Amino acid sequence: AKWVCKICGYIYDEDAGDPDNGISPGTKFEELPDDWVCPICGAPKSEFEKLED
Ligand SMILES: [Zn+2]
C-alpha cells in the first residue's frame, strides 16, 4: 500500500517503510504510531491520502 501527504505532496510507501521515524518495511498505514505525522510538513497521518488500495 502506498500513501501520500495531501498537504505537501510527500509520500509513504508501506513497502519501503519509514525506518527514519521507526517504521519497518512492511508496516501498515493504520498500523503506524498514533503520533505518526508527516516527516515533512508535520501533518498527522490524518492528512495522508491513499493512492487507492
Ligand atoms: Zn506533508
Swiss-Prot record:
The keyword Calcium does not apply. One of its GO terms (biological process) is alkane catabolic process. Extremely thermostable, being unaffected after incubation for 24 hours at 95 degrees Celsius. Transmembrane segments: none annotated. InterPro entries: Rubredoxin (IPR024922), Rubredoxin-like_dom (IPR024934), Rubredoxin_dom (IPR024935), Rubredoxin_ET (IPR050526), Rubredoxin_Fe_BS (IPR018527). Coiled coil: none annotated. Belongs to the rubredoxin family. This is Rubredoxin. The gene is rub.
